[PDB]
């Protein structure tokens, strides 16, 4: 939910403008070993609570790969490149999972964002730095405490 990203005044905030009607996003996650995931989220607002209807599908992960063998440690911080593609706000990211053994596993992200709010002002090409982290979790990850910090900027 990119609503949770610090946007400076000089960059139109597509997400905070998308209410009360809300917005949705679609994302493709292309892993370097063939794994492919599609995630979608329809975000709505009621009172002061954002509701998220998420779907996540993943296929073609090698059975002995780092994903199916649970060898990932965390996502490294990243910088999302935001721009318009055929009129749709899009974010492309060079993502990387740190694995056990001190090596990285790359994944390419492409997220498309679509607001349901009328008259939203579209931003120009910009960036959003991210850092997502699992603060703590139980043995099997049945219970997870997640956290994200994101800041939009103009690079340079």
């Amino acid at each position: 939910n990119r609503v949770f990203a610090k946007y400076p005044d000089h960059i139109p905030d597509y997400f905070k403008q998308s209410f009360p009607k809300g917005f949705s996003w679609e994302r493709s996650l292309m892993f370097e070993d063939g794994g492919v995931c599609i995630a979608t989220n329809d975000i709505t607002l009621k009172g002061d609570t954002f509701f998220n209807k998420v779907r996540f599908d993943g296929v073609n992960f090698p059975p002995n790969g780092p994903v199916m063998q649970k060898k990932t440690l965390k996502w490294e911080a990243s910088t999302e490149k935001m721009y318009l593609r055929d009129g749709v706000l899009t974010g492309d990211i060079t993502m990387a999972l740190l694995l056990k053994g001190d090596v990285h596993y790359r994944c390419d992200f492409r997220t498309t964002y679509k607001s349901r709010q009328e008259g939203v002002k579209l931003p120009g090409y910009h960036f959003v730095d991210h850092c997502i982290s699992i603060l703590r979790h139980d043995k099997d990850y049945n219970e997870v405490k997640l956290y994200e910090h994101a800041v939009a900027h103009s690079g340079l």
């Binding site: 939910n1 002061d48 954002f50 990932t72 219970e143 910090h149």
Partner: protein, 62 residues
């Protein structure tokens, strides 16, 4: 639009997924500071526990 989003907001989430054939459902309850660009959430696997794959692949989708 002139955003009425507050400095403090709550978050409710429901994820339905399937990875390499493994079906699961995860519920989330969190909160965040929109203008600080920070959020946190408590996630619980309601169906499909224990997950047979890296939880990390799911995190940016919450």
């Amino acid at each position: 639009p002139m955003s009425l989003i507050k400095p403090e907001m709550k978050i409710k989430l429901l994820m339905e997924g399937n990875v390499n054939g493994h079906q699961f459902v995860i519920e989330g309850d969190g909160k965040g500071h929109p203008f600080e660009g920070k959020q946190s959430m408590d996630l619980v696997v309601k169906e499909g526990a224990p997950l047979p794959f890296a939880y990390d692949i799911l995190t940016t989708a919450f």
